[PDB]
């Protein structure tokens, strides 16, 4: 499969200043569960945000810098290179990946962060007319996960 994996807020904010706008450990645990043993493709800037490869899956960074060679990352330099990767590939961020990728992906794992944050980066507007809810499961709140949130899984209709 080829999937978006993204958390966005009530106005589709994903990012602020090259970071997530929220602290929400449940969602990062969700990312882990979903992606472990599989492949991430991210934009260069998102890679700079996580700063190192994530363990126990394959990490692929899309970048135009051909001098890019990082330990345990695989570089690619075009959108097209994605479509040849073996297996279940998650588009992992960021704003520009999502824009390039959203009409190409089979499905999307979105966490809707039921808040309104300040962002400088956004997820593309989409329409549920295009997208079928295979599941919708509320996140559980606790002291350390204090923002309401819903795990959507959308298949393209």
Ligand X SMILES: COc1cc(Cc2cnc(N)nc2N)c2c(c1OC)O[C@H](C1CC1)C=C2
Q: How far apart are CA 73 and CA 21, in angstroms?
A: 25
For residues 154 and 51, the answer to whether their CB atoms sit within 8 Å is no
- Contacts to ligand NDP from residues 78-117, by CB under 6 A: 78-79, 93-97, 100
Q: How far apart are CA 72 and CA 60, in angstroms?
A: 9
Q: How far is the CB of 147 from ligand X (least distance, A)?
A: 13
What does DSSP say about strands 149-156 and 131-138: parallel, antiparallel, or unpaired? Answer: antiparallel
Residue 96 binding: pick among ligand NDP, ligand X, none (C-beta 5-8 Å cut-off by kind): ligand NDP
Count residues binding ligand NDP (CB under 6 A): 28
Q: How far is the CB of 98 from ligand NDP (least distance, A)?
A: 7
Task: Report the alpha-carbon angle 90-92-95, nearest 5.
Answer: 130
152 annotated ligand binder: no
**Contact call for residue 121 and ligand NDP (CB under 6 A):** yes
Helix (H, G, I), strand (E, B) or coil at 107: strand
Radius of gyration over every alpha carbon of the chain, rounded to an integer in angstroms = 15
90 annotated ligand binder: no
**Contact call for residue 7 and ligand X (CB under 6 A):** yes
**Binding-residue pattern over the window 97 to 116 for ligand X, x denoting contact by CB under 6 A:** --------------x-----
115 annotated ligand binder: no
Token pair, residue 81, equals 């290179």
Residue set of the binding site: 5-7, 14-19, 27, 43-46, 49, 57, 62-65, 92-97, 100, 121
């Amino acid at each position: 499969t080829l999937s978006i994996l993204v958390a966005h807020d009530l106005q589709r904010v994903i990012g602020f200043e090259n970071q997530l706008p929220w602290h929400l450990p449940n969602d990062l645990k969700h990312v882990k569960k979903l992606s472990t043993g599989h492949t991430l493709v991210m934009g260069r800037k998102t890679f700079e945000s996580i700063g190192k490869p994530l363990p126990n899956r394959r990490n692929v960074v899309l970048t135009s810098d051909t001098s890019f060679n990082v330990e345990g990352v695989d570089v690619i330099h075009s959108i097209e290179d994605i479509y040849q990767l073996p297996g279940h590939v998650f588009i992992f961020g960021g704003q520009t990946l999502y824009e390039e990728m959203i009409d190409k992906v089979d499905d999307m794992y979105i966490t809707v962060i039921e808040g309104k944050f300040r962002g400088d980066t956004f997820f593309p507007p989409y329409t549920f007319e295009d997208w079928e809810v295979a599941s919708s499961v509320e996140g559980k709140l606790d002291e350390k996960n204090t923002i309401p949130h819903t795990f959507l899984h959308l298949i393209r209709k």
